[PDB]
Ligand SMILES: C=C(C)[C@H]1CN[C@H](C(=O)O)[C@H]1CC(=O)O
Ligand SMILES: [Cl-]
Ligand SMILES: [Cl-]
Ligand SMILES: [K+]
């Protein structure tokens with residue numbers, strides 16, 4: 536039947552503008568892990584799509600008392616059929632949209648420059664000399680905002696009090712860790728990609744929690760179950776592990 540509308544956002548190495556001399560248009564403009572996954576799902580399920588970058592360039596957060604923005608809002612409003620992106624599956628977003636079963640699992644951890652030998656978030660929580668933060672209005676910020684763990688409660692207090700500590704996006708966050716005394720609270724799979732390519736960066740400690748990335752849909756979407764079955768089939772054959780290795784494999788560090 537009709538082409539589905541796919542909403543997404545630029546983010547390495549999930550979704551990128553591929554390199555070309557020509558001016559690209561339509562779906563051809565895109566490559567990455569999420570594009571490979573989307574192609575595999577479209578082939579398996581027999582659907583076509585038109586990819587659209589979400590206008591406001593956000594994932595989705597509950598800004599107002601109630602109202603959503605970003606890809607989540609796009610899904611709430613049925614402006615897109617699918618959100619294909621590293622969209623973190625959270626019980627709070629589940630109050631507004633549905634997800635497929637997760638195609639990738641991960642957790643929050645810390646990105647930091649190699650130097651002052653901290654080894655945990657606790658080390659970060661009990662000082663202020665090293666500024667730390669998260670991407671504003673993202674899953675990670677939301678995790679801290681609503682935590683009951685005292686260590687993270689203290690971190691939220693600092694992060695929220697000083698707005699100059701939250702960043703607009705990953706590129707701004709990574710650049711800050713590279714040019715200032717700044718630790719970034721970031722999802723582990725991105726950290727893994729980054730530390731492989733930036734040998735002076737490292738992950739501090741291990742994973743704080745567990746979560747996954749899933750394909751977002753409007754609640755009660757007829758494609759949600761089909762997409763889930765297909766994702767689970769790919770997983771049984773270790774295809775998603777292979778796909779990740781394809782986009783993640785770096786050149787390696789000293
Ligand atoms: C702003 C990015 C890159 C996204 C990706 N996953 C989280 C989300 O789905 O909101 C965000 C990262 C984070 O908040 O650690
Ligand atoms: Cl577009
Ligand atoms: Cl897999
Ligand atoms: K070009």
Ligand SMILES: [K+]
Pocket residue numbers: 536537538582583
């Ligand atoms: K079609």
